[PDB]
Amino acid sequence: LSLRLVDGVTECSGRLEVRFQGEWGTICDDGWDSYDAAVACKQLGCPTAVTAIGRVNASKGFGHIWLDSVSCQGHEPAIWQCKHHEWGKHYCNHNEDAGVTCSDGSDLELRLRGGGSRCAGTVEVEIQRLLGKVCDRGWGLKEADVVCRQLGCGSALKTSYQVYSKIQATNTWLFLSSCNGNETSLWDCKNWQWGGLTCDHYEEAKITCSAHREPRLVGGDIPCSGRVEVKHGDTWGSICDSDFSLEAASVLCRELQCGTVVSILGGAHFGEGNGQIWAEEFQCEGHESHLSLCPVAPRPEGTCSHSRDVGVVCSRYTEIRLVNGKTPCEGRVELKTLGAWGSLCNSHWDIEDAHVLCQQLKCGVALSTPGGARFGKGNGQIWRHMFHCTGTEQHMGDCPVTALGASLCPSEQVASVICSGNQSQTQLRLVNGGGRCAGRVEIYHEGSWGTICDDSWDLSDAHVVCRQLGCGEAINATGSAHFGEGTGPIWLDEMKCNGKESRIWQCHSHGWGQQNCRHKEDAGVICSEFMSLRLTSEASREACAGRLEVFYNGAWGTVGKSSMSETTVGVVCRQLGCADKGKINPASLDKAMSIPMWVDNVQCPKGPDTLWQCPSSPWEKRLASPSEETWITCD
Amino acid sequence: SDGSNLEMRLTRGGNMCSGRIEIKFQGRWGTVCDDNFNIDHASVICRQLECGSAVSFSGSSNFGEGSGPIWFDDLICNGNESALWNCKHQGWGKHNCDHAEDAGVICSKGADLSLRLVDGVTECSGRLEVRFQGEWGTICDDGWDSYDAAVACKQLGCPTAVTAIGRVNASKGFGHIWLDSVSCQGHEPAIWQCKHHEWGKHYCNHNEDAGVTCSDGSDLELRLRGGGSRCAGTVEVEIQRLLGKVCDRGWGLKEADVVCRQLGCGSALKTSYQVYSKIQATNTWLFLSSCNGNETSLWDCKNWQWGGLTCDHYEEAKITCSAHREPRLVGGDIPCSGRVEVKHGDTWGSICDSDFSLEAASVLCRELQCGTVVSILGGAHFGEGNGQIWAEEFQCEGHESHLSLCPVAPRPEGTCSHSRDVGVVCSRYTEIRLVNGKTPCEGRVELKTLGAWGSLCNSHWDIEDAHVLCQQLKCGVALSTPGGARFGKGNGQIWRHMFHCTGTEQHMGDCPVTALGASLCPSEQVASVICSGNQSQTMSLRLTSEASREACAGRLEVFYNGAWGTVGKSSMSETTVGVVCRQLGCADKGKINPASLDKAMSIPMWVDNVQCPKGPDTLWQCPSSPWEKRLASPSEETWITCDNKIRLQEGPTSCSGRVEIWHGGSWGTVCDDSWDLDDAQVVCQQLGCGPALKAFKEAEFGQGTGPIWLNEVKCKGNESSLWDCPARRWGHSECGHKEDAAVNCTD
Ligand SMILES: *[C@@H]1O[C@H](CO)[C@@H](O[C@@H]2O[C@H](CO)[C@@H](O[C@@H]3O[C@H](CO)[C@@H](O)[C@H](O)[C@@H]3O)[C@H](O)[C@H]2NC(C)=O)[C@H](O)[C@H]1NC(C)=O
Ligand SMILES: *[C@@H]1O[C@H](CO)[C@@H](O[C@@H]2O[C@H](CO)[C@@H](O[C@@H]3O[C@H](CO)[C@@H](O)[C@H](O)[C@@H]3O)[C@H](O)[C@H]2NC(C)=O)[C@H](O)[C@H]1NC(C)=O
Ligand SMILES: *[C@@H]1O[C@H](CO)[C@@H](O[C@@H]2O[C@H](CO)[C@@H](O)[C@H](O)[C@H]2NC(C)=O)[C@H](O)[C@H]1NC(C)=O
Ligand SMILES: *[C@@H]1O[C@H](CO)[C@@H](O)[C@H](O)[C@H]1NC(C)=O
Ligand SMILES: *[C@@H]1O[C@H](CO)[C@@H](O)[C@H](O)[C@H]1NC(C)=O
């Protein structure tokens, strides 16, 4: 008895044969596992580093079939010392004659071809200088992550490429049984078959790993803004302002974990780069988790100038730390804004915000908020930001934040949080009214948002609604669908609140779902902390020019001109929706209403698009001369 | 030798139908070399040893060493031969194989084949497994249908009353796939005895493993869940003890009709259901393929599949049968009139007045084949029920076929007591019968009017009217209308209704009819019709007064023959005065009063003794005495004062309270949307109370009763009639009864 390989590609590849009684026959495919191949290559003079089953390059054999159902365990010195069934005692057709491929691991290569970069394309496997593809047999993302990890390109996203289908065709295929998604190389996947079988009705395997179009923000004053860069494989390049869109920025900031897009800026706003410039039009739908999944139009024949880079500013720009604590997960809150650190007041600081704060720093569910200055009094600037987190947001930048006109507080009233430090630890809104503290009232119950009926809806009910929402007292409890009809269920019909209840559902009502109303009687509230902005002038052709008026506590007022800057007028103009910059103007037209001025000394940081997050002096309702009133004109 | 003395034997095998081939010749046993051995030789061999259907052929050491000479070599054989020695060969005893172990064969009758079911919800259910060469393998479901499943169940030994395909609750097995494309015919004693692809490790890929579910029919149930009753919702099945849904591969109305018939809810209308509840998820599904449509149950369909696939890219099947909300008219003195009752699946209830609109009445009269709606009555006109009082509002649009398709808005327990049940009067109220005929398709025409039957007068009777009459009685086209007393003279009143059917009407009540001033005719001139029997065959009125203080409070004049004339007072009843008042544009009530102001023109009379039946709203359909222009004294001349169309109700005094307006036979309310001073001014202009000073909202004087007619009234402030102003007229008002309007005015 003796073994041999025939019509492979080296001395240790191809169809396997055994001589019995003096005649040369083959082994059957059934029962042929990696252990059997290891035993066979141990018997032969071949390396045993990688021992894979399969008939690379081999055609249908010829002769007798002499063995089948080989059940070796890797503890025997020959293929025929195993628990073979019986000599010539079974049937296998000649299309499933056995084969092996054995290597020392020095010439087994994998590469993706036919794509925009090395991490997207059809998978091509080169074994012993023979090049072929991989067939889709359970080829999921779980299988694909092994290949992406082996190549060094992030994690797999989808099984498809885009460009350059001009790939050389071959008739040899690689078959994967099942892999855990846990291995470092596809060669470590259990029982992968090389060649022999052919697969029709089944196409080649496709890959696009995450490192195909990695985005990055390079230079900016605040954490999540700057010039946009994309990595083509191994090389970094900037993006033209022409080939970009709001959806592209949204998916870019979703990939980088920086929240929803708040600003897209043309021109070298953050500085001209030094590198390659791509011309690749992104056509993102907007729901993709990565830029790699974005379909991209092919390159045109034109090229941009380097001074045409595009920049992005996104929501999550809030820098908060804990200081003066025994551990990093306990201490006093300090927030960076406008260029300096400082402590945080606890006028509107509660547990719901501490949860999000300790989820930002990965310290688990918040435990308590010690009062006074238990971890230390303030020794500098005190920021008066009131955070109104619901509690489910993952970062303080997602929460609604108000800093305009905030009221001061003494240094002995600074917030601080102590937290568990264990990572493993883990219901009312206003809509369609504009802003957060005015509009139709909606309540969450039974997994759905519903409305409150108009009947018996008076100002005392809006007191409780806006006390729960943190908007202070109410000014209007409106009905008859003032802000528009809703959609969905109606949860509560009659309100008999005292006006002192802590939350809305402490109120007396007929019971959940006990309603006799329709969607034209939806309830709405307008409250003290409602803010709106406008520009007024007398019968002009343009509306975005004139006197700045802010709405607060139900009354209009003007804004002081002291300490104004270009960025403040810019954010005001953006909020009104007319331009991204503007210029202050003297007291024009020498005529206006004598309404007083509500707030003065407004300072804006980079990143907010709404004036409400610009810190300023506390509210004051005093009369001012037309010299102190602010007039702006936006371009 | 002709081959009679030769004999063949199977040796060293598992049994008689297995092993090495041996042939006896010249007193010596010998074997046959395996050169050029194919399935044809095996088929030939497994024919004369009585073991049939050659399964496998072997070679070399499959059956050990042979002994003796070798008789045959390099034989060529066909697939159908009498014996192995009937083939062409080089010669007896001639061979050049240079081998020692010879050929062996395995026929079906000796192979240790067996069949079993695994991974099932019962002893016999789930995936099929067949033993071949000692290994258990699966069957690919390429062309795996009910006949094969029946054969499998019969072989297994468990009941064959209902046999279905599909692997329920079973996962695809790992191993060989021994059989593929089985084509059993429904009587074979075994699955492998049929025609099937040759035993081999198939690569069948587009398909999955095969399995069966056999049952006796007493453990299969079908239900609907998520709907408003047992006859609406998503369809759920319970086979053995496992629940599932039905995928909508071919879920047509022809498919849903079978389900509705099985449940008993009449017929299928729609493939969607308004959702009253959330239903749980379920892993296994049921699949169908083009049932005939006349099947009594879904278990008698063709090759339905239970399990085996996950219905993705397709959604669950859902239906609403006719019995979901089945209407009925009860307590009526005439057909197509009475109190409305609705069956909610299997219970009858009476509906409340405020939940019904004219569109709902139209759809009800259409579904009952009762025609258009002529009036909606409230306040238990036909009497109050004695059962449940459904409290769901109907949001019907027009042109709907059944009351089940309507959207429905549920409400809490009803505020209304049992004395607010609604009723309807539709259009087809004409009772006609054919009497004194050998068959109901021919005979005398009797018409039921007032409270009695009578013989219709054939003065204006024509063939088109007979066509309509016999289309009503489902008797097809009428043949002829015999004259004279062909079927016997009348035995009572002779109604003189004049029917003017066009010819295409489906009911005699949809034809125009006139009975006022209808001339008399003798006892022998009486109508009667005979028909084929093959069912498949197919005037003005006004009220005058010296001054027009109101609009309907004066002397009555009828227009005929180009002149006006007053109407007699003899036998004037409440219903006749109501009909006149309603026709002339005021509420459905009035009172007759003696002549006033004694200055009406001395116009002659036209008609006397006018009696009006229930159901018609126009005066021309009321039987009476024939026209005559006799002069009449003012003592016999009629004067009527009708109730106005706009009243104020529940107010502490007159000229104040809730606005109620009459239409469609019922008193409805006015919604408070855009209820301001101009509309109140118009309202108190119609009523003779003078200028208004305030308009009220949200049912200040009391919550109303009935439908709602007007919405978003936008009077300019000087319109003569509130019903001249714009508004969402005739319902559609999206207001409850907490929005009833009210007016206060200067006395
Ligand atoms: C797949 O297997 C076939 C054999 O069935 C290989 O074909 C033969 O490969 C051998 C190398 O083992 C070649 O022998 C040498 O070829 C060169 C010329 O190419 C000559 O200089 C040497 O004297 C010697 O003959 C042989 O030519 C070649 N024959 C053919 C017809 O291809 C084949 O190489 C294998 N596949 C691949 C991709 O290598
Ligand atoms: C769905 O298929 C599963 C397997 O894929 C079936 O699992 C097992 O089925 C048995 C009855 O057939 C269940 O009851 C067991 O019965 C025996 C006696 O007959 C007893 O020894 C056990 O203690 C138990 O009562 C068994 O729980 C069940 N096991 C599991 C993990 O499901 C199953 O019957 C099929 N149907 C359903 C509805 O799951
Ligand atoms: C509700 O909002 C309305 C406006 O939508 C307010 O009515 C105005 O209130 C101002 C006071 O700032 C008065 O000068 C105006 O004359 C009012 N207009 C009208 C048409 O009445 C009202 O104050 C708000 N609050 C309440 C309780 O009604
Ligand atoms: C993942 O791979 C590691 C490295 O060999 C191994 O120890 C571990 O068991 C694997 N885990 C699983 C779930 O396969
Ligand atoms: C149902 O109708 C089909 C033709 O549409 C007919 O072949 C079949 O026999 C019918 N079945 C029954 C049970 O009447």
Ligand SMILES: *[C@@H]1O[C@H](CO)[C@@H](O)[C@H](O)[C@H]1NC(C)=O
């Ligand atoms: C109607 O108005 C009059 C006149 O102002 C007033 O005296 C009377 O009380 C009012 N009626 C009601 C029911 O309010």
Ligand SMILES: [Ca+2]
């Ligand atoms: Ca093995």
Ligand SMILES: [Ca+2]
């Ligand atoms: Ca209301």
Ligand SMILES: [Ca+2]
């Ligand atoms: Ca209410």
Ligand SMILES: [Ca+2]
């Ligand atoms: Ca209240």
Ligand SMILES: [Ca+2]
């Ligand atoms: Ca079949």
Ligand SMILES: [Ca+2]
């Ligand atoms: Ca209203």
Ligand SMILES: [Ca+2]
């Ligand atoms: Ca109006």
